[PDB]
Design a protein around this ligand. Structure first.
Ligand code: HEM
Ligand code: HEM
Ligand code: HEM
Ligand code: HEM
Lengths: 306, 306, 305, 306, 306, 305
């Protein structure tokens, strides 16, 4: 039975997202770090038990996989595809390795990130680093509760973990990341009621708008997709706020896990390219994506054994 | 396995119990809310991750079931059976829907109860509303630790959840509720030692009395029942204190979950009607039941699917 | 002169008990008053350090005359009914107030049980409210409630009797009103409309600009300057309460001040209005169902009965 | 169907370790106690839900097994084997019953130990009693983080619980205990760098030394044992610090659980008897074992059915 | 303005009490350590801000005072006075220095005690070391809440601190310590009602018994003392439970602070020698004193100015 | 005179914001200064009782003259650059300092958002640092940091302006410097060598004895006596910060004192050395990249604008 990485674990109060590219000739140094990353997580994490809640999920991109490994490859692993809508675009930016580090305190995340980057220095080039923080009662920088409809329990396992469809990679998952910056000045000019129509839920109480008032181009309408079984396709989102007040940077770091990239991609196509009933997701009128990458997060034992 | 509601979840520090009857003509409104209640739970509950521990268990009575649904019925669902003992009576009182709401804080329970009732206004009449609170080290209003011998783990699952005996309803449970008021002035007139003999356990330390000293009419003796096989029949109790000091109202809200009502009903018969060895449970000389209702709590997917 | 715990902060749980003293019950009450500090310690010590149990005991004007034979606090009088053109602040019976707070309801309940156990047969209960914290210090209107309370030395100056009434130094005056809200009407307003009623932004609790704040907003009417241009302050320990089945959504108002004049001036502005404002808009969504005034003596006064 | 005792549970901030021998004629008293131990744990532990985390693991030694039970014995149950190295000795000391009591607070541990010993008064003689406490960020008295490489999850179940190889005792485990006292004066005369070389991990950060700096006589190198197939053999350690400053007693109470004693014994052999490259584990130059006992901890249901 | 040591601080969940005698020739080493104890406390304590709550109060006995210092001595500093009652005795045992160490966690107490004793090795001989722990809801080993009637605020300052009656030593205090062991077997043979009559308060609820039913040989009656001017004489008690279950040692470590030893001695005389209406305190029928020492705890600046 | 929260303890989160005031920005700034206590309460009240939000506002020497007429604080001047033979304490621009602390970053960030929202178009940001607690009060060098800060009466005497400048009593002076560390070089030292640089034991935080403590150790050089025979003390609220990808491992130094002369004396000793030490060894591993000096007025001074 393969052991997944901590892709099912809940939101925490602190996170570091690190994305790097592998320099020419850095492959061996990377493979050696990948075999040790669980050890490094325990080394730091055990110090803060029982309430540290440190974890690290490590992901590998498509191009990187092809450089690192001469054997089998996950069936759905491909580069993130840029989506160039009429107005808004989902950019594809470089990234070979993802480290999604979470804990109840930033120090633990920073200590682990330090140890990882110490072992990769000279073999990789940093592309992005974000230090995320919880904002009040699980809110995002738009002021809405963010994560409510994430799946839990068995539904989450079914939605997130690779299974018998790709048995060599059972227990893995697919992560899509996008860094979004928000136009807070424009957003704060809307009434609360107008903001609710953009999102599709009530702002203070987090209750969904009824079907007969929710606009077709609201975020919740466009990211609600019925599957063949009539169910509703699900992903697990671990989005975190970030920002810098002096630079007027108010951000949402989007990370979504799914058993196949097709689910996440379908949602992105609906948001950016629109539907018959909606030109594009109105959240994008206040949000700009500035990164976009796709990674496979293998089973823990995959990493330990290479 | 089907996904149960949160019937196996532990005691919390705050609860709201709401029992309502469905008005004539209110059935469609109720069905629509039933299909939404999990959504509403997540709407409020996600705000307080990770410590809020909000849950809501929804139950449906026997008469209401036939008004709401055609076709299949759970095998054990029937109206609560009034027990008229020589001295003490377990009354049957009206109740179509139960909402058992728990959290670590009363605000979450109140917020959810507000949303539920807002969606039911004009379609239901409230019958009972109790706001329960933890009392010191898991004590009840009689001053005894209350919940000790609840089953845990796999034993709890076997005792509480419908299984292969009624497969279309697997993952459901049966809840019996009774609101009890205590005669605290008479109770406080007993010595500690006399109270221990009523209950069957030591007051301060919660250790069970030895079998040579435990009276036949003690509460623990009468609610310990073996199956024909010789296993204990267990139920899961989530009893909470409640009260009002000005009205001299000191209560225990009894709620017990079981895989079939027959177990809870056997215990109630022993308590109210007695055995050859005991006329009745001595706890009832200090405890008056003022409500009594029976509900089936379906698996979560039953409610989601309408 | 050691005060009662009138300066202490909001807690997550509270019980408010108001009783009247039955004829013949005076001696029982005096014995309880002398023991209430003892009872508080008896329960509270169990939950060190984080129980934060306290009890503030208040005595009304009528009761004072029945219990005590000496001087009266200078500002003590029965709550004055205010009959506005539209809204009324009712005066309701109440001789003794127990304002019980802790971080957990069980401590409040255990202490109230002990107090009422000593008083049974001597007092009649008039009101009992079990208050609870609602999210991030919100009230049932969905606004943060308590923000502009004074702190530190400013609170002491605003709340405690001093040299103006030296026999009663260290006391305070408490005004209580139980309010029920019409939540259906309130939820019919847009958020921005609700902000104009209160005078602060709903989600972030930032005060509206002086040039945008309506004259009949709550914050505008309860902001009062004394003749010297200094702000008149009170200390509020309001708690939410309610019952969903009865559609009871409430604010239990309690405010402490050094003299009732300050609290009364605010009530007059709210219910009777000014030249600018007919009445406080908050009252279009809030009905007062009780109204009582109490003096909360220094702790030593009760101990020396 | 076999329910383990709580041998897989995590470290806690408080523990009591109690070892007793059974007096001639005390066998019936002990059997009666063993059948009630779970009941005593619930009696005390329920008082401190949800954060008390009280558990008790009960172990039975080789000689005691034969005096208490007739029938099958566990395959691996024998007396602790003394190891007489050239310099350092692993002593064998008496012990029939082990009670490993853990909680987040010492009071809960002490209250349960009181109830257990109250029932055993007259039937047993105490041999050892240690009250353990968490020291900073999971450090031992040598100043190093202690516990880091314990297995978790499925790997822990595989390393610790008896299975198909001894099916009558499935769900049990073997515990080895050793009380160590440290020579802190000698230890504190080593540089940090020298201490790191004794242990094989960085002191402050708990990061493992790489294979090339890691001495072959370091504690980590000697307790790293690979089985026939190239796989690590693992144990689960719940060691706790203890001490008395006035008597200069600074100790580590060692307790290690494993599915077979052979794993734990091999590690001990490497420590005390050494390898081709290492005469003995350098940790023992600063640590003296003053007790040594081996116990079988049965499945919970085994104890209940007495 | 003399700054006192932390003698007015509240009870904590953990404590270490250390009593040592000063070896002949150890005086200079002890003086140096006295001058550094505040420094050492800061060094350990700062690591656990804001919740560590570490403090250390240092006391010096009468005989030691005269070995360490020259000049004027505190007015009430004498050796503990043995009380030989008809039935029970308050023994006097050796002790030159007291370290009363408190914190919210034992590790902090132990770390500080290690540092202190490290500086004193070879200059002192340990006499007593007790590790105290909070027991449920501020209970003692007799099962009663213990500390309720301690003075607070200005009343505590007035009861505890030396003032103008001995102005050279203003800001100091006197500490009496006695280690008590209890006869729990005898105690548990009493009914709860009989135990209440021994103490003078209700067991479970901690409410004081009425004047009419409170016995005259009850503990609370005998330790309630008024002076000639009608004022209540008070002390501040920081008692902690301690024990060892195997040795059947169930203890109260008594420590009481007062501005003159005469108050504490008057209570001890009433307890051990009795009054007109009571032969002795009934609590002593279940409690034996095994140590007895008196210390002066100087103002902080006195120590620093060494 | 009520001080700002300059005596308050370290917290787990902090934001340090330094801005300069643009052409014509003075009126906007003055209006925000008069409101900053109000904004602090607006946000902070939401997180009672655990949030521990505070904001200390400082004003630089040049900005003082732009914003206010009348008296200046006696000790206010531009930060003095120190060009040592090897190491330099640089001066960089800064008109306003906001030192924001809480138990959680969200509270800091919310307050900083509201402040900057009011200052948009009036100020240019110079520096923004988000500090976090690192294990048991450690800095990025791995040492416990803050141990010897004064407390209680000693801290009030060391930090608050008094009768020496009575118009400004209750104020203080803050020096800030952002330091970046050469962690690769530092980690090249043994623990024992690092202890000799700092002057305390690394794991246990106990001070080295006078026998063993080097004269160019940090603790030696920053222990300064005044003629009074008195230790000169400052109150430090430094916080770690950093970025792993940029190899940025920092200490944000902020030190409060009743006069800048104390802090400047320690800076001189560190950067320029003494008869017995060329410079503080900590500077061989630490580079200052900002330096600014501010006066933090009493709270009532800001309120009164
Ligand atoms: C329906 C009952 C009430 C509700 C729901 C309510 C709610 C609020 C809210 C949300 C605020 C703004 C935040 C704050 O500073 O606390 C506020 C402010 C205030 N309220 Fe009320 N309040 C009520 C009744 C009263 C009454 C009866 C009085 C006085 C007799 C009063 C006096 C104040 C004062 C003095 C302020 C602070 C104004 C300032 O200086 O900005 N309130 N109240
Ligand atoms: C003086 C008594 C002991 C002390 C202070 C001690 C301390 C430590 C420390 C600090 C570590 C490194 C961190 C960790 O993974 O836990 C360690 C690892 C370990 N210890 Fe010990 N230990 C002691 C006795 C023992 C004994 C008696 C055994 C086995 C019989 C044992 C088995 C192990 C094992 C299996 C590991 C993990 C090694 C690895 O795979 O990396 N220890 N111990
Ligand atoms: C033998 C072990 C002792 C135990 C277990 C014990 C226990 C208690 C208990 C349960 C109380 C009532 C609650 C409270 O107010 O703290 C109490 C009160 C008190 N005890 Fe003791 N005590 C002991 C020894 C002493 C000694 C030796 C002294 C004095 C020399 C003392 C002085 C007091 C005082 C002054 C009170 C408060 C009485 C009042 O004013 O109500 N106790 N103690
Ligand atoms: C460069 C980054 C700095 C770091 C990492 C650092 C670190 C430390 C450390 C670890 C201590 C010992 C523990 C303590 O008492 O806090 C210390 C003490 C001290 N530091 Fe620094 N420090 C820095 C810069 C400064 C600066 C710039 C000043 C003054 C202008 C200063 C003044 C002090 C003082 C006054 C003490 C206390 C010395 C004593 O009385 O024992 N520090 N610092």
């Amino acid at each position: 039975e393969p052991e997944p990485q901590m892709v099912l674990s809940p939101l925490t109060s602190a996170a570091i997202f690190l994305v790097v590219t592998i320099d020419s000739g850095g492959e061996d140094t990377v493979r050696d770090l990948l075999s040790d990353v669980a050890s490094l997580e325990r080394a730091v994490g055990f110090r803060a038990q029982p309430d540290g809640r440190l974890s690290c999920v490590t992901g590998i991109g498509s191009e990187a996989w092809d450089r690192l490994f001469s054997g089998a490859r996950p069936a759905g692993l491909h580069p993130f595809r840029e989506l160039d809508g009429p107005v808004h675009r989902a950019v594809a930016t470089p990234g070979d390795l993802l480290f999604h580090i979470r804990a109840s305190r930033l120090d633990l995340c920073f200590a682990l990130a330090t140890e990882i980057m110490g072992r990769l220095r000279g073999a990789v080039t940093p592309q992005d680093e974000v230090h995320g923080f919880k904002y009040f009662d699980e809110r995002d920088m738009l002021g809405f509760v963010d994560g409510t409809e994430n799946p839990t329990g068995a539904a989450a396992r079914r939605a997130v973990l690779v299974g018998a469809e790709d048995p060599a990679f059972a227990g893995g998952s697919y992560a899509v990341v996008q860094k979004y910056l928000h136009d807070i000045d424009a957003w704060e000019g809307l009434s609360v009621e107008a903001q609710e129509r953009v999102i599709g839920r009530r702002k203070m109480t987090d209750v969904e708008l009824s079907d007969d008032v929710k606009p077709a181009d609201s975020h919740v309408a466009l990211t609600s997709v019925t599957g063949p079984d009539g169910s509703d396709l699900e992903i697990l989102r671990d989005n975190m706020p970030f920002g810098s007040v002096g630079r007027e940077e108010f951000g949402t770091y989007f990370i979504g896990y799914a058993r196949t990239p097709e689910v996440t991609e379908t949602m992105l196509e609906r948001m950016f390219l629109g539907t018959a009933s909606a030109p594009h997701d109105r959240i994008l009128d206040f949000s700009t994506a500035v990164t976009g990458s796709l990674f496979f997060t293998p089973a823990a034992d995959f990493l330990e054994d290479l």
